[PDB]
mmCIF file of all heavy atoms in Angstrom:
data_model
loop_
_atom_site.group_PDB
_atom_site.id
_atom_site.type_symbol
_atom_site.label_atom_id
_atom_site.label_comp_id
_atom_site.label_asym_id
_atom_site.label_seq_id
_atom_site.Cartn_x
_atom_site.Cartn_y
_atom_site.Cartn_z
ATOM 1 N N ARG B 26 50.187 1.088 4.181
ATOM 2 C CA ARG B 26 49.182 2.067 4.610
ATOM 3 C C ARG B 26 49.812 3.304 5.225
ATOM 4 O O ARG B 26 50.709 3.215 6.072
ATOM 5 C CB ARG B 26 48.163 1.441 5.562
ATOM 6 C CG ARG B 26 47.363 0.309 4.913
ATOM 7 C CD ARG B 26 46.426 -0.335 5.893
ATOM 8 N NE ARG B 26 45.431 0.626 6.336
ATOM 9 C CZ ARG B 26 44.542 0.385 7.289
ATOM 10 N NH1 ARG B 26 44.534 -0.796 7.901
ATOM 11 N NH2 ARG B 26 43.671 1.328 7.629
ATOM 12 N N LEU B 27 49.352 4.464 4.772
ATOM 13 C CA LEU B 27 49.840 5.725 5.287
ATOM 14 C C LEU B 27 48.683 6.585 5.769
ATOM 15 O O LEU B 27 47.654 6.688 5.097
ATOM 16 C CB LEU B 27 50.652 6.463 4.217
ATOM 17 C CG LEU B 27 51.118 7.899 4.502
ATOM 18 C CD1 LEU B 27 52.363 8.195 3.732
ATOM 19 C CD2 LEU B 27 50.073 8.920 4.121
ATOM 20 N N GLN B 28 48.855 7.191 6.943
ATOM 21 C CA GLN B 28 47.960 8.256 7.405
ATOM 22 C C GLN B 28 48.802 9.442 7.812
ATOM 23 O O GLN B 28 49.793 9.293 8.524
ATOM 24 C CB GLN B 28 47.106 7.825 8.587
ATOM 25 C CG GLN B 28 46.329 6.545 8.360
ATOM 26 C CD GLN B 28 47.124 5.307 8.717
ATOM 27 O OE1 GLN B 28 48.144 5.382 9.412
ATOM 28 N NE2 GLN B 28 46.666 4.155 8.237
ATOM 29 N N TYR B 92 44.589 3.547 -3.606
ATOM 30 C CA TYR B 92 43.708 4.482 -2.921
ATOM 31 C C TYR B 92 44.448 5.685 -2.354
ATOM 32 O O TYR B 92 45.502 5.540 -1.737
ATOM 33 C CB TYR B 92 42.977 3.761 -1.785
ATOM 34 C CG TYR B 92 42.327 4.670 -0.766
ATOM 35 C CD1 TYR B 92 41.268 5.523 -1.116
ATOM 36 C CD2 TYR B 92 42.739 4.639 0.566
ATOM 37 C CE1 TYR B 92 40.670 6.351 -0.153
ATOM 38 C CE2 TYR B 92 42.150 5.439 1.523
ATOM 39 C CZ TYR B 92 41.121 6.295 1.165
ATOM 40 O OH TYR B 92 40.562 7.078 2.151
ATOM 41 N N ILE B 93 43.906 6.874 -2.610
ATOM 42 C CA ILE B 93 44.291 8.073 -1.879
ATOM 43 C C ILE B 93 43.041 8.854 -1.476
ATOM 44 O O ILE B 93 42.119 9.009 -2.274
ATOM 45 C CB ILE B 93 45.249 8.982 -2.683
ATOM 46 C CG1 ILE B 93 45.529 10.280 -1.910
ATOM 47 C CG2 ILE B 93 44.675 9.300 -4.046
ATOM 48 C CD1 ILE B 93 46.634 11.185 -2.547
ATOM 49 N N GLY B 94 43.000 9.319 -0.230
ATOM 50 C CA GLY B 94 41.859 10.069 0.268
ATOM 51 C C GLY B 94 42.355 11.322 0.957
ATOM 52 O O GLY B 94 43.364 11.283 1.660
ATOM 53 N N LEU B 95 41.672 12.439 0.733
ATOM 54 C CA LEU B 95 42.050 13.705 1.349
ATOM 55 C C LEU B 95 40.878 14.248 2.147
ATOM 56 O O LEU B 95 39.734 14.135 1.719
ATOM 57 C CB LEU B 95 42.421 14.752 0.302
ATOM 58 C CG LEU B 95 43.576 14.617 -0.684
ATOM 59 C CD1 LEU B 95 43.740 15.928 -1.499
ATOM 60 C CD2 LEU B 95 44.856 14.240 0.035
ATOM 61 N N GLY B 96 41.171 14.862 3.288
ATOM 62 C CA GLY B 96 40.161 15.521 4.095
ATOM 63 C C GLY B 96 40.666 16.934 4.292
ATOM 64 O O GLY B 96 41.764 17.125 4.796
ATOM 65 N N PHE B 97 39.897 17.931 3.882
ATOM 66 C CA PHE B 97 40.412 19.288 3.959
ATOM 67 C C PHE B 97 39.328 20.309 4.214
ATOM 68 O O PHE B 97 38.141 20.097 3.908
ATOM 69 C CB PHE B 97 41.205 19.652 2.687
ATOM 70 C CG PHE B 97 40.358 19.752 1.453
ATOM 71 C CD1 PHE B 97 39.927 20.997 0.990
ATOM 72 C CD2 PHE B 97 39.978 18.606 0.759
ATOM 73 C CE1 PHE B 97 39.139 21.098 -0.157
ATOM 74 C CE2 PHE B 97 39.188 18.692 -0.402
ATOM 75 C CZ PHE B 97 38.766 19.941 -0.855
ATOM 76 N N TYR B 107 44.145 16.121 5.851
ATOM 77 C CA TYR B 107 44.364 14.710 6.155
ATOM 78 C C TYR B 107 44.584 13.903 4.884
ATOM 79 O O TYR B 107 43.868 14.101 3.897
ATOM 80 C CB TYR B 107 43.181 14.145 6.959
ATOM 81 C CG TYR B 107 43.045 14.778 8.333
ATOM 82 C CD1 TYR B 107 42.401 16.002 8.494
ATOM 83 C CD2 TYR B 107 43.590 14.174 9.458
ATOM 84 C CE1 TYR B 107 42.284 16.589 9.734
ATOM 85 C CE2 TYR B 107 43.476 14.757 10.705
ATOM 86 C CZ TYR B 107 42.815 15.967 10.836
ATOM 87 O OH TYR B 107 42.691 16.567 12.071
ATOM 88 N N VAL B 108 45.578 13.011 4.906
ATOM 89 C CA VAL B 108 45.878 12.135 3.757
ATOM 90 C C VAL B 108 45.938 10.647 4.121
ATOM 91 O O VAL B 108 46.681 10.267 5.036
ATOM 92 C CB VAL B 108 47.229 12.538 3.103
ATOM 93 C CG1 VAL B 108 47.526 11.701 1.888
ATOM 94 C CG2 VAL B 108 47.203 14.009 2.717
ATOM 95 N N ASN B 109 45.149 9.825 3.428
ATOM 96 C CA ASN B 109 45.355 8.354 3.428
ATOM 97 C C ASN B 109 45.942 7.915 2.101
ATOM 98 O O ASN B 109 45.458 8.324 1.047
ATOM 99 C CB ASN B 109 44.071 7.553 3.527
ATOM 100 C CG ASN B 109 43.400 7.649 4.874
ATOM 101 O OD1 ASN B 109 44.047 7.699 5.906
ATOM 102 N ND2 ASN B 109 42.070 7.666 4.857
ATOM 103 N N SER B 111 46.931 4.016 0.427
ATOM 104 C CA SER B 111 47.003 2.565 0.639
ATOM 105 C C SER B 111 47.319 1.833 -0.657
ATOM 106 O O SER B 111 47.011 2.324 -1.740
ATOM 107 C CB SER B 111 45.685 2.028 1.207
ATOM 108 O OG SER B 111 45.362 2.652 2.438
ATOM 109 N N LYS B 219 46.622 8.578 13.180
ATOM 110 C CA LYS B 219 46.035 7.275 12.890
ATOM 111 C C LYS B 219 44.586 7.205 13.394
ATOM 112 O O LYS B 219 43.744 6.525 12.802
ATOM 113 C CB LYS B 219 46.904 6.163 13.502
ATOM 114 C CG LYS B 219 46.452 4.753 13.188
ATOM 115 C CD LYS B 219 47.501 3.703 13.597
ATOM 116 C CE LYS B 219 47.054 2.310 13.153
ATOM 117 N NZ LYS B 219 48.179 1.349 12.939
ATOM 118 N N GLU B 221 42.632 10.340 14.592
ATOM 119 C CA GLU B 221 41.906 11.545 14.182
ATOM 120 C C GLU B 221 41.385 11.453 12.741
ATOM 121 O O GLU B 221 40.359 12.046 12.395
ATOM 122 C CB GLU B 221 42.827 12.758 14.318
ATOM 123 C CG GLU B 221 42.212 13.976 14.987
ATOM 124 C CD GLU B 221 43.229 15.090 15.207
ATOM 125 O OE1 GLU B 221 43.864 15.529 14.221
ATOM 126 O OE2 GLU B 221 43.407 15.521 16.369
ATOM 127 N N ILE B 222 42.098 10.695 11.909
ATOM 128 C CA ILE B 222 41.806 10.604 10.481
ATOM 129 C C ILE B 222 40.541 9.792 10.184
ATOM 130 O O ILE B 222 39.987 9.867 9.084
ATOM 131 C CB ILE B 222 43.017 10.025 9.704
ATOM 132 C CG1 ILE B 222 43.005 10.492 8.241
ATOM 133 C CG2 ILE B 222 43.097 8.480 9.862
ATOM 134 C CD1 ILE B 222 44.390 10.407 7.563
ATOM 135 N N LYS B 223 40.083 9.021 11.166
ATOM 136 C CA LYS B 223 38.852 8.255 11.008
ATOM 137 C C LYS B 223 37.643 9.091 11.384
ATOM 138 O O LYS B 223 36.505 8.642 11.235
ATOM 139 C CB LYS B 223 38.885 6.971 11.842
ATOM 140 C CG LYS B 223 39.859 5.931 11.345
ATOM 141 C CD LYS B 223 40.376 5.099 12.496
ATOM 142 C CE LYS B 223 41.309 3.996 12.017
ATOM 143 N NZ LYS B 223 40.637 3.060 11.077
ATOM 144 N N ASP B 224 37.884 10.316 11.848
ATOM 145 C CA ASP B 224 36.795 11.159 12.347
ATOM 146 C C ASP B 224 36.782 12.594 11.790
ATOM 147 O O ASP B 224 36.421 13.539 12.491
ATOM 148 C CB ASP B 224 36.827 11.185 13.878
ATOM 149 C CG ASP B 224 35.491 11.593 14.488
ATOM 150 O OD1 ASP B 224 34.440 11.407 13.821
ATOM 151 O OD2 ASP B 224 35.499 12.103 15.636
ATOM 152 N N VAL B 225 37.161 12.771 10.530
ATOM 153 C CA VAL B 225 37.226 14.128 9.983
ATOM 154 C C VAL B 225 36.142 14.399 8.948
ATOM 155 O O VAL B 225 35.966 15.537 8.511
ATOM 156 C CB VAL B 225 38.620 14.469 9.410
ATOM 157 C CG1 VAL B 225 39.659 14.455 10.523
ATOM 158 C CG2 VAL B 225 38.998 13.498 8.292
ATOM 159 N N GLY B 226 35.418 13.350 8.565
ATOM 160 C CA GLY B 226 34.291 13.498 7.668
ATOM 161 C C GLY B 226 33.237 14.486 8.146
ATOM 162 O O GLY B 226 32.604 15.173 7.333
ATOM 163 N N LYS B 227 33.048 14.567 9.460
ATOM 164 C CA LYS B 227 32.046 15.466 10.031
ATOM 165 C C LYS B 227 32.333 16.955 9.788
ATOM 166 O O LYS B 227 31.404 17.743 9.651
ATOM 167 C CB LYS B 227 31.869 15.190 11.530
ATOM 168 C CG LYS B 227 33.109 15.480 12.357
ATOM 169 C CD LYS B 227 33.002 14.920 13.769
ATOM 170 C CE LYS B 227 34.211 15.326 14.603
ATOM 171 N NZ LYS B 227 34.237 14.645 15.930
ATOM 172 N N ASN B 230 35.738 18.776 3.979
ATOM 173 C CA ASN B 230 35.522 18.193 2.657
ATOM 174 C C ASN B 230 36.267 16.858 2.607
ATOM 175 O O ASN B 230 37.362 16.734 3.181
ATOM 176 C CB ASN B 230 36.037 19.111 1.544
ATOM 177 C CG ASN B 230 35.232 20.398 1.422
ATOM 178 O OD1 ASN B 230 34.144 20.534 1.993
ATOM 179 N ND2 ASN B 230 35.756 21.340 0.649
ATOM 180 N N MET B 231 35.666 15.854 1.966
ATOM 181 C CA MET B 231 36.357 14.584 1.731
ATOM 182 C C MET B 231 36.409 14.317 0.235
ATOM 183 O O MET B 231 35.429 14.519 -0.475
ATOM 184 C CB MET B 231 35.637 13.427 2.423
ATOM 185 C CG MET B 231 35.436 13.623 3.931
ATOM 186 S SD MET B 231 36.962 13.380 4.869
ATOM 187 C CE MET B 231 36.905 11.582 5.037
ATOM 188 N N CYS B 232 37.564 13.897 -0.256
ATOM 189 C CA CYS B 232 37.664 13.435 -1.638
ATOM 190 C C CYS B 232 38.603 12.243 -1.685
ATOM 191 O O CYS B 232 39.490 12.098 -0.857
ATOM 192 C CB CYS B 232 38.108 14.535 -2.618
ATOM 193 S SG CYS B 232 39.694 15.213 -2.234
ATOM 194 N N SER B 233 38.375 11.357 -2.630
ATOM 195 C CA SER B 233 39.145 10.137 -2.658
ATOM 196 C C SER B 233 39.139 9.623 -4.067
ATOM 197 O O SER B 233 38.238 9.937 -4.845
ATOM 198 C CB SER B 233 38.533 9.093 -1.733
ATOM 199 O OG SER B 233 37.180 8.930 -2.072
HETATM 200 C C1 LIG C 2 41.174 7.535 5.888
HETATM 201 O O1 LIG C 2 40.873 6.150 5.939
HETATM 202 C C2 LIG C 2 40.062 5.794 7.048
HETATM 203 C C3 LIG C 2 39.833 4.301 7.007
HETATM 204 O O2 LIG C 2 41.049 3.733 7.424
HETATM 205 C C4 LIG C 2 38.718 6.482 6.939
HETATM 206 O O3 LIG C 2 37.886 6.062 8.003
HETATM 207 C C5 LIG C 2 36.439 6.029 7.977
HETATM 208 O O4 LIG C 2 36.031 7.352 8.319
HETATM 209 C C6 LIG C 2 34.620 7.505 8.304
HETATM 210 C C7 LIG C 2 34.280 8.997 8.401
HETATM 211 O O5 LIG C 2 35.447 9.777 8.272
HETATM 212 C C8 LIG C 2 34.001 6.642 9.427
HETATM 213 O O6 LIG C 2 32.585 6.767 9.558
HETATM 214 C C9 LIG C 2 34.419 5.177 9.216
HETATM 215 O O7 LIG C 2 34.077 4.403 10.330
HETATM 216 C C10 LIG C 2 35.934 5.039 9.029
HETATM 217 N N1 LIG C 2 36.278 3.682 8.660
HETATM 218 C C11 LIG C 2 37.044 2.913 9.435
HETATM 219 C C12 LIG C 2 37.468 1.607 8.829
HETATM 220 O O8 LIG C 2 37.405 3.224 10.576
HETATM 221 C C13 LIG C 2 38.883 8.000 6.918
HETATM 222 O O9 LIG C 2 37.656 8.542 6.485
HETATM 223 C C14 LIG C 2 39.905 8.386 5.864
HETATM 224 N N2 LIG C 2 40.225 9.781 5.949
HETATM 225 C C15 LIG C 2 40.256 10.482 4.814
HETATM 226 C C16 LIG C 2 40.531 11.956 4.918
HETATM 227 O O10 LIG C 2 40.069 9.953 3.721
#
Side-chain angles (χ1 to χ4, degrees):
Chain B
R26 298 177 64 186
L27 173 153
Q28 307 87 16
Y92 164 65
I93 175 172
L95 298 186
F97 68 99
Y107 295 82
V108 183
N109 290 323
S111 301
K219 184 169 185 154
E221 226 174 56
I222 206 159
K223 290 150 177 300
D224 201 25
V225 296
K227 64 192 185 188
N230 293 347
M231 304 285 276
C232 60
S233 54

